[PDB]
Amino acid sequence: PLLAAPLAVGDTIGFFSSSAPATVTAKNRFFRGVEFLQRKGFKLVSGKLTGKTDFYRSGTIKERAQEFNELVYNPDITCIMSTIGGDNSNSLLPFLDYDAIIANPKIIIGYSDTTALLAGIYAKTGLITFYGPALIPSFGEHPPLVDITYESFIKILTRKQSGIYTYTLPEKWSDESINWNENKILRPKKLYKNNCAFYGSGKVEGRVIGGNLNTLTGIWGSEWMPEIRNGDILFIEDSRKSIATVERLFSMLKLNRVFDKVSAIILGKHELFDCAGSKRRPYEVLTEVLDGKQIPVLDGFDCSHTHPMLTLPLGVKLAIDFDNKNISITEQYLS
Amino acid sequence: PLLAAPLAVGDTIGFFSSSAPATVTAKNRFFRGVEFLQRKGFKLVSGKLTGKTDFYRSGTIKERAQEFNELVYNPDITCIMSTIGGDNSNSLLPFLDYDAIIANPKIIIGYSDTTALLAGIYAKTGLITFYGPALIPSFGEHPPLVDITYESFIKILTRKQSGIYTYTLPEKWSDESINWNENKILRPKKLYKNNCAFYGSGKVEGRVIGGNLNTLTGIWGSEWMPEIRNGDILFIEDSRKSIATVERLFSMLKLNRVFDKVSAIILGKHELFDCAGSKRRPYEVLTEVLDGKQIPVLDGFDCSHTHPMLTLPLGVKLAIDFDNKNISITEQYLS
């Protein structure tokens, strides 16, 4: 695989808005994120669409592609970070400079809609990209949860590439929809004990592939969708979806013979899942769709829209030990 | 292609609920639709899940597949009609009795989520299925618009299969979300003059393929998605989507090389499109996504979630005359 250089404190991070114009619509949270990373010692370069709006998006398809490409061309940038997701990053894919990415690999990181770019770039270049923090939703989060997010971010991206890395388990988490873009908090978010579950036995090791499942529908079938291969671990997360939508997306995977290929499935915690009064969780829906197929599942991995968020390299081998209830990165993911 | 026997006055229509349990949740409209078709002289067979609920759906995946299969097995039934869409018909596809469908061809008709079944059945069997009325939303519609829907339904399905059929243009249409599930209208719907537009020149003839675009994402990449070929006419419609979602879906098609293949595009009228204040219409978004690729477009065909609704056979040749502003079926679609 193509590997980027590791991050270091003091490096320059460039940010881009490939979809929603949240540097404008969530300006307070944006400024909190900027200040948070600057206090950590990072220099920040603002993408050319920062502070711009085109109603539902930051700019035209071509302008958004240019914003991203210009960060790739900047030799001072070691990390290219999404500001926020949305709906529209898949539009950029024909216009990204994949050759420039190959020529100067960098850490590319984000989540949700940005999945289209993370997966598309991997498909075209083999670059190991990262499902992880976006500037506004992740680093604009108030303490204490932002600190746990940052701890994972900095650990994953700066650690020495020797031996496996076993993920820490966040003690508490939240998906409560408060303290988004307000300047001062009235109360901290409701905290829940970590209820992640390991369904299966033994150890499973394989290349992790996926991201935001709803977003994957925007690139599915194309040359930008990385091929899922025998032995892959499928990582999928979604946010604020109805149980109806979740069934549809799981069945899509089934129809595509994905469940005949994968060695395990990681379900990210589903932010504010709407069960339609059924009291069913996504895992139960998956179980019905699987129709007897014995695939081990890590249900509730903290790499999703919930806080805090862990950083996950995509396209490298992970080992899930279902007996010891842990998950590790086992393949080198930075140079 | 495999062709079903034509419909006739006095025939038996069977209905099924492959997703949303609207025979319960929209029972008044359901009863009005039933009465409407009965007064036209049709005999109705209720699918086994009529009157049942499993929260967001009519029943389990297997229960829903069984309901559909049971109608296929009934020799008295000439037409199998969806009650309503939803989100979840794609789940049924591994469990449909395709051999029985081939052995006992029938008119299969519906829209929206039912696209998964219409396209999936065509992909597996070559049967010409129909994008058209569902019992509850279409035939439960209050006068005057239901009569225009019915006129197309009965004309398309009962007419002699000799010579081309040129579609009538509804004089007025509406997309208002009122008068859904009550005995009486609150007030009459706004009636719009028909503003469909023919972008391009000359005549394009090709096999029509598609349906509800959002729904197609649930079968995309699988053996149930019919292959789009050079010269095809793409038919797509969506309902109540944001401009953000519409851009995403159009870009999905672009990434899949669909716009390198198709000779024309038909856009169904988009029910209550949300432009996010941009004042842009779906055609403008399509134009940006196309990036200079010249494809003639029929913008605003009355075969969608708007009322009234025309009946369209899928998988047969149509001819769009962009100079004379009309659209015709040119290939036999029933026995």
Side-chain angles (χ1 to χ4, degrees), chain B residues 53-98:
Chain B
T53 55
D54 186 42
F55 305 96
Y56 67 99
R57 58 188 190 174
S58 55
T60 68
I61 296 170
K62 288 174 176 177
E63 282 177 327
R64 287 177 281 142
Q66 285 159 20
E67 186 192 38
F68 186 91
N69 289 337
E70 283 177 344
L71 299 179
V72 178
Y73 304 148
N74 193 331
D76 295 338
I77 299 178
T78 55
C79 174
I80 297 173
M81 180 183 288
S82 172
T83 55
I84 201 159
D87 291 279
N88 300 118
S89 75
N90 71 323
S91 290
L92 280 63
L93 292 169
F95 308 103
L96 299 187
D97 196 336
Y98 299 106

Side-chain angles (χ1 to χ4, degrees), chain A residues 54-57 59-62 64 87-88 90-95 113 214-224 242-249 251-257 275-280 285 288-289 291, chain B residues 54-57 59-62 64 87-88 90-95 113 214-224 242-249 251-257 275-280 285 288-289 291:
Chain A
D54 187 36
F55 304 93
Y56 67 100
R57 58 186 192 175
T60 65
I61 297 170
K62 285 177 175 175
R64 284 179 283 144
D87 292 278
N88 299 117
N90 72 323
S91 289
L92 283 62
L93 291 171
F95 310 106
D113 183 65
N214 193 61
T215 300
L216 289 173
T217 66
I219 67 171
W220 205 268
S222 82
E223 70 205 65
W224 290 275
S242 68
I243 183 161
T245 298
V246 166
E247 184 189 321
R248 193 178 78 82
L249 294 168
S251 278
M252 184 278 291
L253 295 170
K254 183 196 178 73
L255 302 182
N256 276 267
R257 299 175 177 269
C275 70
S278 72
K279 302 286 181 290
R280 294 167 192 165
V285 184
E288 189 195 358
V289 171
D291 191 21
Chain B
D54 186 42
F55 305 96
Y56 67 99
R57 58 188 190 174
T60 68
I61 296 170
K62 288 174 176 177
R64 287 177 281 142
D87 291 279
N88 300 118
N90 71 323
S91 290
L92 280 63
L93 292 169
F95 308 103
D113 183 66
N214 194 58
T215 301
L216 288 173
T217 68
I219 66 170
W220 205 269
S222 82
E223 70 202 70
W224 289 276
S242 68
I243 184 161
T245 297
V246 168
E247 185 189 320
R248 193 178 79 82
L249 295 168
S251 279
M252 185 279 290
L253 296 170
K254 185 197 176 69
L255 300 181
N256 276 267
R257 302 180 177 266
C275 70
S278 72
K279 293 182 179 290
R280 294 165 194 166
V285 185
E288 191 195 357
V289 172
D291 187 27

Side-chain angles (χ1 to χ4, degrees), chain B residues 22 31 70 106 117 130 140 161 163 192 201 233 313:
Chain B
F31 274 31
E70 283 177 344
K106 296 178 195 299
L117 305 184
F130 297 83
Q161 298 280 319
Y192 301 121
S201 63
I233 295 168

Side-chain angles (χ1 to χ4, degrees), chain A residues 37-185 187-220:
Chain A
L37 290 179
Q38 283 176 338
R39 278 274 191 173
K40 296 295 182 182
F42 294 104
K43 294 173 180 176
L44 303 176
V45 168
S46 57
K48 67 168 185 173
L49 297 176
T50 302
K52 314 296 180 188
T53 53
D54 187 36
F55 304 93
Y56 67 100
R57 58 186 192 175
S58 55
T60 65
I61 297 170
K62 285 177 175 175
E63 276 299 278
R64 284 179 283 144
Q66 284 193 13
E67 183 189 42
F68 185 90
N69 289 339
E70 283 180 33
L71 299 177
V72 177
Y73 306 153
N74 191 328
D76 294 321
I77 302 284
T78 61
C79 175
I80 297 170
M81 179 183 289
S82 173
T83 56
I84 202 160
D87 292 278
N88 299 117
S89 75
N90 72 323
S91 289
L92 283 62
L93 291 171
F95 310 106
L96 297 185
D97 198 336
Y98 302 106
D99 287 331
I101 294 166
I102 295 161
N104 192 14
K106 297 175 191 294
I107 295 160
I108 305 174
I109 189 163
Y111 72 105
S112 203
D113 183 65
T114 320
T115 297
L117 305 186
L118 301 171
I121 289 163
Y122 176 70
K124 295 290 276 188
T125 71
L127 178 66
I128 303 309
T129 64
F130 298 85
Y131 209 77
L135 181 64
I136 301 171
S138 310
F139 290 123
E141 175 73 355
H142 290 284
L145 298 178
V146 70
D147 299 317
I148 309 299
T149 298
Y150 181 78
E151 177 53 52
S152 180
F153 172 84
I154 204 74
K155 181 70 180 180
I156 294 294
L157 298 175
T158 70
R159 65 176 282 278
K160 289 287 180 185
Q161 299 281 314
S162 56
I164 73 165
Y165 173 80
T166 304
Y167 280 96
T168 55
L169 183 73
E171 293 177 356
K172 288 175 184 179
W173 65 278
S174 190
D175 64 348
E176 191 177 21
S177 188
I178 59 159
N179 309 332
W180 173 250
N181 194 45
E182 291 90 334
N183 276 316
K184 282 184 177 70
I185 58 158
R187 62 167 179 90
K189 287 180 177 176
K190 286 178 71 68
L191 296 172
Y192 311 107
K193 292 182 92 286
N194 208 316
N195 59 345
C196 78
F198 288 76
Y199 297 107
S201 63
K203 194 205 293 183
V204 176
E205 186 176 14
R207 179 188 67 154
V208 68
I209 190 161
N212 185 271
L213 182 53
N214 193 61
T215 300
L216 289 173
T217 66
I219 67 171
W220 205 268

Side-chain angles (χ1 to χ4, degrees), chain A residues 244-296:
Chain A
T245 298
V246 166
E247 184 189 321
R248 193 178 78 82
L249 294 168
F250 287 163
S251 278
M252 184 278 291
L253 295 170
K254 183 196 178 73
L255 302 182
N256 276 267
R257 299 175 177 269
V258 172
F259 301 136
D260 300 332
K261 296 176 184 173
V262 299
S263 60
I265 298 160
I266 304 165
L267 303 177
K269 287 193 173 69
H270 200 299
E271 177 194 37
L272 301 165
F273 178 64
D274 176 15
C275 70
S278 72
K279 302 286 181 290
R280 294 167 192 165
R281 295 307 302 182
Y283 180 67
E284 192 182 331
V285 184
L286 179 63
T287 299
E288 189 195 358
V289 171
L290 284 172
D291 191 21
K293 208 156 286 292
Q294 294 184 252
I295 303 174

Side-chain angles (χ1 to χ4, degrees), chain B residues 18 49 52 77 188 317:
Chain B
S18 60
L49 296 176
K52 307 288 181 182
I77 299 178
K317 285 179 279 183

